[PDB]
């Protein structure tokens, strides 16, 4: 029944910390690994000495971030063989992550994954956490995804991508890296949840009331929403109980496998109703990817409630939105909203700016308006590639220039794929 998590690049690794911090609070697991208290062993394994170890691998082509992971509060939680580091980073270059540097460590990484899969009996698949604009996040992940489709080809793989945003952007070439990994990882991913760092920035400035958010601010907010999606796998709910069901419910087209996630409520630490939070799921301000679903057709839509929730309140709030708003669906869809509930309360971090809420909801909806997000990257990409800007860096690290065009055509074809569904 088990599931393995992988974290690539600083983004993956540092969001991983926020998620496994939040997983251990939700499961009452201690920083040293003990537990004074199954469905949760989908994510954790067990030592003979009563210690609960995550089924996770941490990867970065550079020690600094994982060194802090290896000496952080949760240093005892992970086995040292799970934390893998190189020396030379990818330097915001997809080519180095995928071709030049990534090939030097890919075999060691795949080997340490086999050690966790050998401990498992009925392995389900893989969760993958990585940035778009990062060199490691883009290049190495796309490589690792290719190789996991070989050594474990007959099982699922899910992405957690960090969509770039100029407000926290570290590189000019982040459009390049995003397009390049999304091209080569498209065929090897069954489902992929994008996270626009701008929306997370906007949300933290408005609803968390922070002037200039830090990465901890964004990661904590993100970790809450990741927990909402993986809650079904860790507590044995009714909906989305295994990795296949994510494809079943949300993916009616292998290529178009990019759901929009909306999370309410985000309450500052300085209660709402079931109906009020469900209306906020159709408010663009609380989306994780900045677009307008009103300009698009829904292919699917799931609601994952958790907390003090009465099943009848849900059905009322559903009928309200299905009658008092005009949510356009495609004609070849069931058009019925799937629902699942988990009565455990949303855990926050002690000290966090996010407050404990009585109930919460996370709406996963594969709307065609998310094509707007791809259009923004494609445009930025076109401006630089029209002059072949920064292209020599990529071509100089083992990459053919044609791969740029082959990726761009695959992105243009995906934009047409989103258009034809919604007309």
């Amino acid at each position: 029944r088990e599931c393995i998590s992988i974290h690539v690049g600083q983004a993956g690794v540092q969001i991983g910390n926020a998620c496994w911090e939040l997983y251990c609070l939700e499961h009452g697991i201690q920083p040293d690994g003990q537990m004074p208290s199954d469905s949760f062993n989908t994510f954790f394994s067990e030592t003979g000495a009563g210690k609960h170890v995550p089924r996770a691998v941490f990867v970065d082509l550079e020690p600094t971030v994982i060194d802090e992971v290896r000496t952080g509060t949760y240093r005892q939680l992970f086995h040292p063989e799970q934390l893998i580091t190189g020396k030379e980073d990818a330097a915001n270059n997809y080519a180095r992550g995928h071709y030049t540097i990534g090939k030097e460590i890919i075999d060691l990484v795949l080997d340490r994954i086999r050690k966790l899969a050998d401990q498992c009996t009925g392995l389900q698949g893989f969760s993958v956490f990585h940035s778009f604009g990062g060199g490691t996040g883009s290049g190495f992940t796309s490589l690792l995804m290719e190789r996991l489709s070989v050594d474990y080809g007959k099982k699922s793989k899910l992405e957690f991508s960090i969509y770039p945003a100029p407000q926290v952007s570290t590189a000019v070439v982040e459009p390049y890296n995003s397009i390049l990994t999304t091209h080569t990882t498209l065929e090897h991913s069954d489902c992929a949840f994008m996270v626009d760092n701008e929306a997370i920035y906007d949300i933290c400035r408005r609803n968390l009331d922070i002037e200039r958010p830090t990465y901890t601010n964004l990661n904590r907010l993100i970790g809450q929403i990741v927990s909402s999606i993986t809650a079904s796998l860790r507590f044995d709910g009714a909906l989305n109980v295994d990795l296949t069901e994510f494809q079943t419910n949300l993916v009616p087209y292998p290529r178009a496998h990019f759901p929009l996630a909306t999370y309410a409520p985000v309450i500052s630490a300085e209660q709402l109703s079931v109906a009020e939070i469900t209306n906020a799921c159709f408010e663009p301000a609380n989306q994780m990817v900045k677009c307008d679903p009103r300009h698009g057709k829904y292919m699917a839509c799931c609601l994952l409630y958790r907390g003090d929730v009465v099943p009848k309140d849900v059905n009322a709030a559903i009928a309200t939105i299905k009658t008092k708003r005009t949510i356009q669906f495609v004609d070849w869809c069931p058009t019925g909203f799937k629902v699942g509930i988990n009565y455990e309360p949303p855990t926050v971090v002690p000290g966090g700016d996010l407050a404990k809420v009585q109930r919460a909801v996370c709406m996963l909806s594969n709307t065609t308006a998310i094509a707007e997000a791809w259009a923004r990257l494609d445009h930025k990409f076109d401006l630089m590639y029209a002059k072949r800007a920064f292209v020599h860096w990529y071509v100089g690290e083992g990459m053919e220039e044609g791969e740029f065009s082959e990726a761009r055509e695959d992105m243009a074809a995906l934009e047409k794929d989103y258009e034809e569904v919604g007309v």
Binding site: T248, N249, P252, P254, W332, P334
Partner: protein, 155 residues
């Protein structure tokens, strides 16, 4: 592709494994290569329970293919009287035309399905409809020696 397994099942006639594939959200109107939906295939090979399953889940009763054949065309060709009345009851096109100019009445008359001919006629079939060569359903009975059909066409 889940839309391709639903065509494999609806054709070969595994009634049970349609419900399995459809419970996984398979495309009810998934086109193969020549534009044939599963409703086309089930209406060709006589799988009545699979036709009624797809129709009530939302199957285009008047879907055409690359050659303009509706499922009512194919049902009236092979001679599946049980399916013909199911399609017509689900709003089938009684006077649909295909690329060769034939209506379902042409096909049921050529193949000698006298019991299906009378059903189509009573659902308002065009007895004077012509094909490419310019022949009606009545001309086919004259040309083919069928006097059992000539009388059933003027009723």
């Amino acid at each position: 592709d889940l839309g391709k397994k639903l065509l494999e099942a609806a054709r070969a006639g595994q009634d049970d494994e349609v419900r399995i594939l459809m419970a996984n959200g398979a495309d009810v109107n998934a086109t193969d290569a020549s534009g044939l939906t599963p409703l086309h295939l089930a209406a060709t090979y006589g799988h009545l329970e699979i036709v009624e399953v797809l129709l009530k889940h939302g199957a285009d009763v008047n879907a055409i293919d690359i050659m303009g054949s509706t499922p009512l065309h194919l049902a009236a060709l092979i001679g599946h009287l049980e399916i013909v009345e199911v399609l017509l009851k689900h709003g089938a096109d009684v006077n649909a035309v295909d690329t060769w100019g034939d209506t379902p009445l042409h096909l049921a008359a050529i193949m000698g399905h006298l019991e299906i001919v009378e059903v189509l006629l009573k659902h308002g079939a065009d007895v004077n409809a012509q094909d490419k060569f310019g022949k009606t359903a009545f001309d086919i009975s004259i040309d083919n020696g069928n006097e059992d059909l000539a009388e059933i066409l003027q009723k």
